[PDB]
Amino acid sequence: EVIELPLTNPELFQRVGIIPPKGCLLYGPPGTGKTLLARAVASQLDCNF
């Protein structure tokens, strides 16, 4: 919701009257899938990464 959605349809946020958020922090105890999660994003979003 912070990577794809407002990278495709920025207009949805101008109608509300805000600006999409710039940047996520994945944090949490080791081994829980923080790198695997970005691995999944990189396989799919289709743009420079």
């Binding site: 912070v2 958020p21 710039k22 940047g23 996520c24 922090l25 994945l26 944090y27 949490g28 105890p29 080791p30 081994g31 829980t32 899938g33 923080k34 695997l36 999660l37």
Partner: protein, 97 residues
């Protein structure tokens, strides 16, 4: 403003542990790993990767006994083994943002 989201990825839950095990255990040849509920019940404190270990360990007992398949004990032992060293091997603390 600089970083707008604080996504906290937490330790797996009851459903979760199960889904991860099922994702990992799938590729293992077997005769019916039917007791997932004791496995999920013992595997507390297990993070995504430590369930990835359990499914391997269960494999290793098979390679040791020289089977071409695992069984329901292989995954029962592996959870006891991993769970001993996981507790032994240093305490993990939550670091909030």
């Amino acid at each position: 403003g600089r970083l707008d989201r604080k996504i906290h990825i937490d330790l797996p839950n009851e459903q979760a542990r199960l889904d991860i095990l099922k994702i990992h255990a799938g590729p293992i040849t077997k005769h019916g790993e039917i007791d997932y509920e004791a496995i999920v019940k013992l595997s507390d404190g297990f993070n995504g990767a430590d369930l990835r270990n359990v499914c391997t360990e269960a494999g290793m007992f098979a390679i040791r006994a020289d089977h071409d398949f695992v069984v329901q004990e292989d995954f029962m032992k592996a959870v006891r083994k991993v769970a001993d060293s996981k507790k032994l091997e240093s305490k993990l603390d939550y670091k909030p943002v």
